[PDB]
Write a protein that binds this ligand. Structure first.
Ligand SMILES: NC(=O)c1ccc[n+]([C@@H]2O[C@H](COP(=O)([O-])OP(=O)(O)OC[C@H]3O[C@@H](n4cnc5c(N)ncnc54)[C@H](OP(=O)(O)O)[C@@H]3O)[C@@H](O)[C@H]2O)c1
Ligand SMILES: NC(=O)c1ccc[n+]([C@@H]2O[C@H](COP(=O)([O-])OP(=O)(O)OC[C@H]3O[C@@H](n4cnc5c(N)ncnc54)[C@H](OP(=O)(O)O)[C@@H]3O)[C@@H](O)[C@H]2O)c1
Ligand SMILES: NC(=O)c1ccc[n+]([C@@H]2O[C@H](COP(=O)([O-])OP(=O)(O)OC[C@H]3O[C@@H](n4cnc5c(N)ncnc54)[C@H](OP(=O)(O)O)[C@@H]3O)[C@@H](O)[C@H]2O)c1
Ligand SMILES: NC(=O)c1ccc[n+]([C@@H]2O[C@H](COP(=O)([O-])OP(=O)(O)OC[C@H]3O[C@@H](n4cnc5c(N)ncnc54)[C@H](OP(=O)(O)O)[C@@H]3O)[C@@H](O)[C@H]2O)c1
Lengths: 309, 308
């Protein structure tokens, strides 16, 4: 591909939603270009994926390999870079951090979201070695083990509820006295015999040997520091939507800051579609299967928009 | 399993949506039971599947096998039978010949039934050049001549994508007008390699090992023509499970599909649905989206049960 050159559609991102959209866009014979920074997106920080039907207990690394090979069978050009802006015109102009500008009749955003990190020692050290950011995804991996879940929202509460059906013991560590998660989940989890609430507390450090062995916690009231032996730590403290990219490109966001889409993945800007974690659809529920399917839908909406145009 | 046993969730159907919901249901630790008549559902009539990301050019029969192995890894019991009734008494699911089962929730993945055409050769050339899905199989017919039967959105969109891959397309329709959206008609109309064959019907499909011709009859003149084609795409629609829905107190939309909101919730609390029996992404009949809706319906089933 050459700086310049127009495409029927340019896909921003290289996570599951992006591959999903790429596969369908290429199969509809739209001239397609994928521009994204990290191949696999969040799959780069996953370990074993067993929630994508048909790809049994597959290594995330292998999942990325086969997703890329699948779109490469259709010869979709993939540029590894960052999209800086998406300019409206008649036709779209998409600027990258290096590779230049490209034109397109439609654009599909699969930019994902940034996971919020605790920012404490041991966090990167043990990522993928006892630390997970997805309870629904990795809970089955902790049957009869001891774990801690960190946060006080719907995903931390639902995480603890799921982990309670697998783990011997679950510590729900949250920094406030109260929870913003739905009261229903709170009441539900409190009633669990193997769940212990550790309120007004924050994690100070995550320790271990080859893997996680303990979480050091500080009670923010009593200043008291204590160590809990755990086999795993699930960080469920939320995400940062790409509200700045959206606003910066004239794209409407919902009341949560996510890219606003309708059923068929259409954004507020005619000709611009979006898929995966960056959208308002199925907020909360972030899985590979749903992002890949939303990509197929976004690609379908772009095909209809381009062919009708 | 045994009649009378209780489950957290019972999934009806054994298609991609059902596999999808069973996978997430078992992983949420919901005691799960799948009751479906035909394993793989519509996948039974497909050939190579190359639109489900990560499963490259896989035979539909092998997609069915790995889908089943994925849920059997979680020991989800599968009962091969037909669900006759779903009653709210918790739920009591009545099957045709295996008894009744109890459940706190139910996920419907019953799909739709393809409208049969029924013309000589249709059976003789199954998998032999006859397809029931233009978007799925178009890439397999690059530089080949094909015919598309139908006059709706499916047929027109099919003729549109096939016009891009194929040499030429014969759009054969029995009416003088189209049931497809006007925008679809004018778009196809502008494709130089799409030839409308209106007020016409297919009389039969011929070939040797594979399809080689289609015999069409003009309803207004009785004239007959043999058209040489390498492929025949039958796009005449599907019949939703309206009657099943109404018989079970489930609301349907204006097209007769089971109505669901964004979370795959039907009009009945505790009853969810996924895949092409639902009103969501109506007409988009893809394995990938059906599997995803199953994950969503299993998640809504999970939230419902844990909160009950
Ligand atoms: O699951 P999912 O597929 O929804 O999400 P995901 O797994 O988070 O993947 C989203 C993808 O979008 C890429 N991306 C984000 N902002 C981008 C930009 N402005 N230009 C180019 N690529 C960008 C990400 O790379 P980075 O991680 O490098 O931003 C990532 O690979
Ligand atoms: N309907 C459902 O079943 C469901 C399930 C899961 C998620 N969701 C949705 O998805 C969205 C995001 O879910 P979410 O619960 O992950 O995000 P969230 O609603 O933002 O809650 C996460 C919480 O973690 C805490 N936290 C943040 N940074 C922290 C830090 N550095 N150290 C310790 N604690 C920290 C915060 O609590 P404080 O700021 O209060 O201290 C924060 O609000 C929500 O809008 C939610 O409704 C829905
Ligand atoms: O794609 P998709 O997964 O959405 O749909 P799909 O491929 O059409 O599969 C739907 C599944 O539901 C089954 N089914 C339909 N009505 C049923 C009933 N009343 N009781 C039990 N099984 C039933 C089908 O078997 P049949 O072939 O027997 O309908 C099939 O396995
Ligand atoms: N919005 C979109 O872009 C889109 C795209 C694809 C599919 N869809 C959805 O998919 C659903 C079903 O597919 P569809 O729209 O193609 O079905 P459809 O709306 O029923 O149109 C198919 C047509 O095939 C003709 N036909 C039926 N039986 C026939 C036979 N035995 N011999 C010859 N011709 C026959 C019929 O025309 P006559 O009855 O007039 O003879 C029939 O209306 C739709 O209801 C729609 O919601 C939507």
């Amino acid at each position: 591909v050459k700086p310049g050159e127009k495409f029927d559609v340019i896909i921003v991102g290289l996570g599951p939603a992006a591959y999903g959209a790429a596969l369908y866009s290429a199969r509809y014979m739209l001239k397609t270009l994928v521009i994204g920074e990290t191949p696999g997106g969040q799959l780069t920080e996953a370990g074993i994926v067993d929630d994508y039907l048909g790809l049994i207990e597959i290594q995330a690394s292998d999942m990325i390999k086969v997703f890329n090979k699948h779109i490469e069978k259709y010869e979709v050009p993939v540029l590894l870079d960052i999209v800086e802006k998406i300019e409206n015109r008649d036709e779209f102009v998409v600027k990258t951090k290096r590779k230049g500008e490209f034109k397109a009749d439609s654009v599909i955003l699969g930019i994902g979201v940034k996971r919020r990190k605790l920012g404490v020692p041991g966090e990167q050290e043990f990522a993928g070695r006892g630390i997970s950011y997805c309870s629904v995804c990795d809970a089955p991996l902790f049957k009869n083990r001891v774990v801690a879940v960190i946060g006080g929202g719907d995903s931390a509460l639902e995480g603890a509820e799921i982990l309670s059906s697998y783990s011997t013991k679950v510590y729900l560590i949250h920094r406030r006295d109260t929870f913003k998660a739905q009261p229903i989940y709170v009441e539900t989890v409190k009633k669990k015999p193997n769940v212990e609430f550790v309120l007004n507390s924050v994690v100070k450090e995550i320790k271990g040997d080859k893997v996680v062995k303990q979480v050091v916690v500080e009670n923010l009231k009593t200043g008291e520091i204590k160590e809990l032996n755990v086999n795993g730590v699930f960080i469920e403290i939320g995400f940062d939507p790409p509200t700045d990219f959206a606003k910066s490109n004239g794209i409407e966001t919902d009341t949560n800051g996510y890219i606003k889409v309708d059923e068929w993945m259409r954004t507020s800007v005619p000709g611009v579609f979006a898929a995966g974690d960056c959208t308002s659809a199925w907020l909360g529920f972030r899985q590979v299967i749903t992002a890949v399917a939303q990509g197929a839908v976004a690609a379908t909406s772009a095909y209809r928009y381009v062919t009708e145009k």
